Symmetry: C3
Subunit: 313 residues, 3 copies
């Protein structure tokens, strides 16, 4: 029961809604899902073919064994930490990739992650369009920014970006992507801090942003050990986000992975957060479709994450 | 069963005893307990009113919910958590003063705010012991934490050795030293397992006039040494005795996590001090609620055990 | 079940086998096992008499209580971090030792381990002989090298040594031993890396070694958090080791403290790994025999570890 992190009461009427909205990613170029099944997925990231666990890929693989057995890297093991197997000669920590004009690194760590969630291109497209068509310089806030591809998309489009992540290591990775992308001179502020602390302090300062993106994990830790738990804390976070939106704000975008909840729960939370603000809240799932070996052969849907987006419409 | 951490054999009579002794504080300073109940407590720390869990505060709160809700900071979660700041975001630290010593309250990911204000009773004993001493005194403060006792002793003119296994905690204590204006005071900062340090002091023939020790139920030395109060305390107290000066003024043991009785601490202390004369006083250290006005005595909240040997 | 870490299929005949081979050390010079029983052991390491837990010492102690009660240090256990008791007086962190001509430090940490496995002298003797009777300087690889006494034995004998350990702290200890042993100028290359990642990279580089020693724990962690689990990963490890043996290799030596397995399981793994390579695989247990107080007095066997050794013999 939420005692201390409740959203504040707002006046006015709930915004309009579009729900469910299923967003489906196209590859993308350097990424496609080749095949999946038996609790695994087979993905192409540029020159690297990778096998990773995907528990919900319950069905049987449709692409021949020979294609799976030609993978460059296979993630194995059971905390979250495991071991990559490299069955041929592909090796080192990193490899270059590009999505939506932004060059960044795929990276093998002890975790199953590869340094990008390429399905998020659908949201980066929304972001890029919003920045490049705005007739004024925009401020974009990116919370839980990870390897920073959204930050770089926004920076490349002309935004003044503030990227927030509690992990100094992840900030380092994002900065490496910034160099690779040729965006060293772009206005990106790198904030290594707990995300909710940063925004509450921004609220106290009276700071505002035109677009806020937020990608909270189910569980996290702030830079000074502050426990983050999505189901305990999200209502306060979104409330503070609204308090730091500019009068002419273009959007508030929430993405959520790996969570025992429907998009309807993100949706109704977002609708209530934005009570009296007008506009429209669109929510649902973000999915990838299998594309086969050639990348042109549509197959099954693999749902990755939830989203809810407010816009002034 | 304790096989390897037994105290040495002693001769003579057990010291005199005063037991139970209940030591009480009510916060006539930058601290008081406002209210408690339903497994929580409402406290004033200087400019901030804070709400923290207190599982043994089983009774019902006497101050209206509206007041608790109005707190500046609430500690939440299941040991790490998250502080909620309902009015507006608060900075990490805020200045406090107790017994003439200025130090920092601190919001960390834990429930601890950087001070145990009830310990002012033991600080007052210490302050008096040092002040009224004819001679310069050597004070050892084991498991010293944020070091308010170290600063009290330094301010009274003692030569202080502060021992804590945590470099982070030493850092906080040093920050307090600076804020308190005690940078030129003789405080030696030792980052080491406490029992290792005192056994090495014994080997060196070092002595101290006053020893305070605040061991946790479980801890870890600077180099991973496992500390467990019920396995190791008998040996620690025995070594403490071995490093007391001939004219020592006291040995003070404080113990949180109040599962064992003060009687156990008491019988162990008394036996450790066999043949040393003086008196062992033991019991609990408690805070009494003071209400919104700080002047309305309420319920007792017991925080810790203590046992103190003095030549008294 | 092993899906991703199988050794390649080999053709040809399994090497000859000698099994069980029980290797026994009675402790010379600075080490011997005085007595053991009641789940404890009483050992002399140079000038210190030490008591440590030894759960399999189920029998009774045969040396009087007085002698045990005169110990300089006793390890007392939460299980495996604990606390050393020094009953006579506080002991410093380290003390000088020497075995097989190599000077190194005994060390009190929060674990039961004193900085050397002196029973390993039997394998060090095999190694010393192999290096010092060779007609060329041998390349010796030592995986999971710990405090590096084997590395120092090989280097003293004239080998070019590569020492691999994921722990920077352990590498630091080994280097301290190198200094103490007077081997600072010797060709020892200190590698702080996951052992399997290092050897796969060696394989890619086409590198070879004349002798390979590997002492994998049941469970470990690479420098960059890679999970090591002997039962999941050892088959691939040994196969890569084979691929980095020189044509004129003198041996591949596996040691394992995972006592629960039989030496037969290390044996058959090593035999199959070396299929078609000729030579001989000898496997069994490495044991210490109690030496008692005075005279060299043969007592009970304390088995410490498993081993399997391939040689071209
Ligand atoms: C942890 S999530 C990982 C990706 C995706 N959102 C998911 O849940 O799988 C994205 C980023 O959030 C960061 N993070 C976790 N807790 C945080 C916190 N309390 N404040 C700021 N960033 C945090 C992580 O360091 C990471 O780079
Ligand atoms: C951990 S206790 C916490 C306060 C109070 N004594 C309690 O138990 O709740 C006080 C200090 O003991 C220190 N400490 C814990 N184990 C220690 C050890 N083995 N040696 C020296 N200091 C230790 C901690 O770093 C901390 O600052
Ligand atoms: C095997 S462990 C301890 C000694 C003995 N083998 C045992 O299991 O009890 C020996 C060394 O392996 C190292 N180690 C553990 N995991 C490793 C890894 N993944 N790669 C390289 N070294 C590792 C440790 O740092 C340690 O110094």
């Amino acid at each position: 029961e939420n005692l201390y992190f409740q959203g504040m009461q707002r006046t006015g009427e709930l915004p309009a809604e579009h729900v469910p909205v299923i967003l489906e990613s196209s590859g993308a170029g350097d990424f496609h899902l080749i095949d999946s099944g038996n609790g695994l997925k087979l993905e192409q990231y540029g020159d690297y073919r990778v096998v990773r666990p995907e528990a919900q890929a319950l069905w049987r693989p449709l692409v021949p064994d020979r294609v799976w057995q030609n993978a460059d890297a296979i993630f194995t093991g059971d905390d979250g930490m495991g071991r990559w197997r490299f069955p041929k000669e592909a090796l080192g920590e990193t490899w270059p990739l590009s999505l939506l004009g932004v060059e960044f690194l795929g990276r093998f760590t002890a975790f199953r992650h590869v340094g990008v969630f390429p399905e998020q291109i659908v949201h980066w497209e929304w972001l890029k369009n919003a920045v490049e068509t705005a007739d004024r310089p925009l401020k974009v806030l990116n919370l839980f920014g990870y390897t920073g591809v959204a930050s770089l998309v926004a920076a490349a489009a002309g935004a003044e970006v503030t990227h927030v992540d509690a992990s100094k290591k992840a900030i380092g990775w994002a900065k490496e992507n910034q160099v690779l992308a040729g965006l060293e001179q772009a206005p990106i502020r790198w904030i290594c801090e707990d995300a909710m602390k940063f925004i509450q302090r921004e609220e106290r300062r009276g700071s505002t942003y035109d677009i806020i993106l937020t990608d909270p994990p189910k569980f996290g830790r702030g830079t000074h050990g502050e426990v983050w738990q999505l189901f305990d804390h999200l209502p306060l976070m979104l409330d503070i986000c609204r308090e730091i939106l500019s009068p002419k704000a273009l959007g508030l975008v929430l993405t959520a992975y790996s969570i025992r909840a429907s998009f309807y729960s993100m949706h109704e939370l977002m609708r209530e957060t934005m009570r009296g603000a007008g506009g429209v809240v669109a929510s649902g799932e973000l999915v990838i479709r299998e594309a086969g070996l050639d990348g042109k052969t549509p197959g099954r849907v693999l749902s990755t994450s939830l989203f809810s987006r407010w816009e002034p419409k």
